[PDB]
Amino acid sequence: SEFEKLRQTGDELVQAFQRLREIFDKGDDDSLEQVLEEIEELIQKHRQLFDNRQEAADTEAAKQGDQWVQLFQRFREAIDKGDKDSLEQLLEELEQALQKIRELAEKKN
Numbered sequence: 001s002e003f004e005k006l007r008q009t010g011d012e013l014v015q016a017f018q019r020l021r022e023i024f025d026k027g028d029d030d031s032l033e034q035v036l037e038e039i040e041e042l043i044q045k046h047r048q049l050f051d052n053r054q055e056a057a058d059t060e061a062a063k064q065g066d067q068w069v070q071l072f073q074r075f076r077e078a079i080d081k082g083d084k085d086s087l088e089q090l091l092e093e094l095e096q097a098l099q100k101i102r103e104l105a106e107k108k109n
Contacts, residue, residue: 006053006105009046014098016042021091029079036076043068055107071097 016039023031047065054061071093078086 001053002049006046006049009042009049010098010102010105013039013042013046017094017098024087024091032079033076036072040072043072050105056104068097 016035020032020035020039023035051061051065071090074086075090075094078090
C-alpha cells in the first residue's frame with residue numbers, strides 16, 4: 001500500500017548516498033555533513049513508513065533502526081576523528097545495508 005512513497009524515498013536515498021560518496025572523494029567534510037542532515041530528514045520519513053508497515057518482528061524492525069542509527073552515529077564520529085579508514089569502511093557497510101533494506105522492502109523471503 002502506497003509503495004510509491006516507499007520506493008521513491010528509497011531511490012532518493014540511494015541517489016543521495018552516491019552523491020555522499022562522491023563528495024567524500026573530494027574531501028569536502030562541509031558538504032558531507034550537510035548531506036548527512038538531509039539524509040537524516042529522509043531517514044525519519046522512510047522510517048515512519050517502514051515503522052508503520054512493519055510486517056516482520058517488531059523487535060527486529062526496531063533493532064534494525066538501532067543498527068542504522070549506529071552506522072550514521074559512528075560515521076560522524078569517524079569524520080570528527082578524521083579517520084578515513086573508518087569512513088571508507090562505513091561507506092561499504094552503508095551500501096550493503098541499502099541492498100538489504102531494499103530486498104526487505106520488496107518482502108523477499
